[model samples]
Target chain A: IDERDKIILEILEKDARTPFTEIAKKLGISETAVRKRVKALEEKGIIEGYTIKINPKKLGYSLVTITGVDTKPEKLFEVAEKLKEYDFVKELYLSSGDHMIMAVIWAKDGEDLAEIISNKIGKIEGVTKVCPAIILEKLK
Target chain B: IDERDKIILEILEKDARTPFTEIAKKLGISETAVRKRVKALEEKGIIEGYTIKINPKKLGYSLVTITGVDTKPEKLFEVAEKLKEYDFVKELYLSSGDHMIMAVIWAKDGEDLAEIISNKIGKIEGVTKVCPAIILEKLK
Candidate 1:
């Protein structure tokens, strides 16, 4: 991203609510020019989407975590597909060695998460083990 | 705190970008009344501060949430305070129990997150133990 795109990104970083008109006003550019630049940024995939930052607690997900998992290799894609369907699985990825799929979950509390792992996740055919390291501090 | 306050909270939750005048029109209340209620919510510490939501992957931090910490009771607050000062800490919280605080972090990749937790969080004085949890997907 160049300087102007960077500026637009910076503005969105703090306030996605910023109007194109305001950004144009600040950058001393026309509103149409600002809109075009933003469209370009979006097309380049630099700006994926605008999203809401919601409080997990308020949404009944009072608990959050990074879950370490071990799954059968052949069944891995299946497990990943199931996880991908879960609304609470905010983020997920494959890791090296015995622990394959690492995931982040948000739930109402410990029991709520435990139920998900023991009941829903454990039932997955390819899944063998699941470990929840309840988040103590998230230093993003 | 109450229904009226809860109404204000829900409105803000829908969109921090929401205008008090718009809310006033919807709630059939005066604009001044809506503004007064919002100010009260802020004064009561219900609304922490307004923030924007940006997709980290779009901004280059693809792998997120690398650390889940366990801390001594007295020292937990210090850990929270310290994390609060870190720019990469996207989300932080104080839960109930031995695992009291949770932090959600963002990193460009696993190695980058590992460096922060292993080199930085591990070096923090009051930190008792640090465990990493990597996200695989975010359904929301």
Candidate 2:
């Protein structure tokens, strides 16, 4: 990507719904050109998807945790798929390190989180271990 | 905060740019009503912001990690602000338990990540411990 593409991405990263007219004016370009560049960026897969971030705290999901999971090497993808079934899982990724998978989860309270861990995630056959780190605050 | 509100939020969560007219048509409501609800949601702080989720790997940032930071209790916010100055930090949250801060960071490779942790993050005052968990694959 060139400097222009990078600038467009940065602008959208700050606010994706920013009007093309606004961006074009800021960059000294035509609105049509701005739209074309954004479309091109999306087509190139550099811009995967646009979505809104909700404050879980406001939604009554008062808890967030980063859970580490370990499983047999052969069952990595299989286990990751199983974890994806839960709506509480905000983001899940396979990580290289002490654990094979890492998941970001949300819950209503400590009891709810515990139930999700013990009743749902713990029951998954290939889930060898689950280590949760509760989030106290989101600084950024 | 009601069922209708939840549905609107869910639609926006999937694709924030989904026009209000489409949502209104699907819900059998007036576009003006949908627009009003969205505006109220924003005012309520339920909807924080709309942004794009980029694949760092596609952007030449092939390495992603979930790092846990242990800091002095009083310095949590101060330390997190320092971490946010780095462009590679995708998400930063002050977490409970042993790690006071949890950050999702990106790098070109293992060596680059190490340099960031040791040379940059390690030198920050009040940052006592830095634990990096390299991501293997993003399932979701």
Candidate 3:
């Protein structure tokens, strides 16, 4: 909420594992003060649970695919549950787009994605359309 | 990565700040063993930097908007750079979709997004179209 708190969030956004002492040194505040602020941020629900921001390439994925899937109205949730069982689907969301399901997938190559999009996803009943859009580049 | 390493990653994937002692206890390994494995995972580029996932509602945002923005071919990068300057733009990507820029935006309400999509973003030079899709529900 203050200048110092924003600074803390910025640092943690880049690396949540940053030690309190490091942030304290940057802010010229006590380590306990930095810790207290982070605790308050979490308690107030401003900061959800911490997690690692993955690098798909480093993990051997060749491309990032953002595919949109349209499904039957009643079968939307069931289709979503089935999609979660696949390893290629990393991030899944029931979107408000033309497609009810939006999946952010990481695949080894074109063939890998081709198989998943056409076979794995299409095979799931109630899936009407699958529009796969690969991430050509991450601009920002 | 062995069984222990996968376990370590699964635990951290849920909560990056999970202490070594806790992970060690779950896997029936020593704390030193858990710490060393995490170090190896980082060195091998398996585990990327940590981050806190934010909840839009907790942050006072009423909805999560997935906007696909189309810009002039030559203005793609410039448009992306401009998008990053705004606080509402959380994650941005250049994709192979009809639109060149894909932005995940957090807005206070319908009026807030109306102002941003129509006035702020649409007014930018080279910007052609903005399709804002609010996430009705996050099934995942």
Candidate 4:
């Protein structure tokens, strides 16, 4: 909410392990103040969780797809529920855009990705078009 | 790359701060082994970095857009290079799909998103079209 909170957040967003003592020095405040502010932010549900940014490529998910799925407006929620059941669909979202649901999927290879899009996701009731983009590289 | 390694990753991916002692308990191995394996994974570049997942909604970014941008053939990479400079474009990727680039963007509200799409991205040369879907909720 304040500039101090925002500044601390910017660093943690990059590296959650960033020491509060260092953040304190940046703001000319005590480490206690920085620690309390971070804990307060957590209490407000702004800082959800700490996690790792893993390389999916090295983990054997060679084919990654960013896909948009079109469904009948009435069945949107049902479609999303079904889509998330598969572990391969790592991230799924309900959206107000060209498509009803958008998903980030992981697969072993190209053939695996195709089967997931066509055979698995396409079979859901009321599903229409599946627009998928194979991510060649992450630019950022 | 083994079951032991995969298990450690599964937990760390969820909570990077998860203690090695706990992971060792799960794998029936010593904490030193868990620690060693994690270090090895990092050396292999499988473990990229530790970070936090923040709630954009709580941080004044209520409007988050998952967008696809179409660009001219020759200028695809050049366009991506320029797009990444804008901090609002949180995640950008080069893809082989209907669009040349896919990005996840953050904004203050509906008005802010409209300005970001038209005023910033649409202003770029060789940008054919911008298809953005406002993320209503993260299903997963």
- How well is each residue in A1-140 modelled by candidate 4, as lDDT tens digits? 89898888878888788888888999888999999999988888788888878888988899888888999888998999999998788899988876779899988898988888789999998788788778999988
lDDT of 4 at B108: 92
- Residue pairs in clash, model 3: none
Docking verdict class for candidate 2: medium
Residue B8 alpha-carbon offset, candidate 1, angstroms = 20
For model 2, residues B1-140, the per-residue Cα lDDT tens digits are 78878889989988888999999998888999999999888988899888887878778888888888888878988889999988777889877655778888888898999999999898989999999888888887
Tell me the tens digit of each residue's lDDT in model 3 across B1-140: 58898788879888888999999999999999999999888988888788887677876788898999999989988899999888788889988987879999888999999999998888888899899988887654
- The lowest-lDDT stretch of 10 consecutive residues in candidate 2 chain A is A131-140
* Model 4 quality (TM-score): 0.89
Worst 10 residues of 1 chain B by lDDT: B93-102
Summarize candidate 3's per-residue lDDT along A107-127 as a digit string, tens digits.
889999898888899999989
Ranking by lDDT: 4, 3, 2, 1
Off by over 4 Å in 1: A2-7, A22-36, A96-98, A135-140, B1-65, B68-75, B91-140
Two-chain DockQ for each candidate model? 0.18, 0.72, 0.71, 0.76
All candidates' lDDT scores? 0.71, 0.86, 0.86, 0.87
> Mind giving the per-residue lDDT tens digits that candidate 4 earns over B61-123?
998888889998888887888899997898999888777798899989989989988999988
Per-residue alpha-carbon lDDT of candidate 1 for residues A9-50, written as tens digits (9 for 90 to 100): 767756676888998998888989889988887786776655
Worst-scoring 10-residue span by lDDT in model 4 chain A? A94-103
CAPRI-style quality class for the chain A–B interface of candidate 1:
incorrect
Better of 3 and 4 by lDDT: 4
Candidates' RMSD to native: 7.1, 2.4, 2.2, 2.3
TM-score of chain B of 2: 0.88
- Residue A71, candidate 1: Cα error in Å is 1.6
| Candidate 4: Cα lDDT at A91 | 90
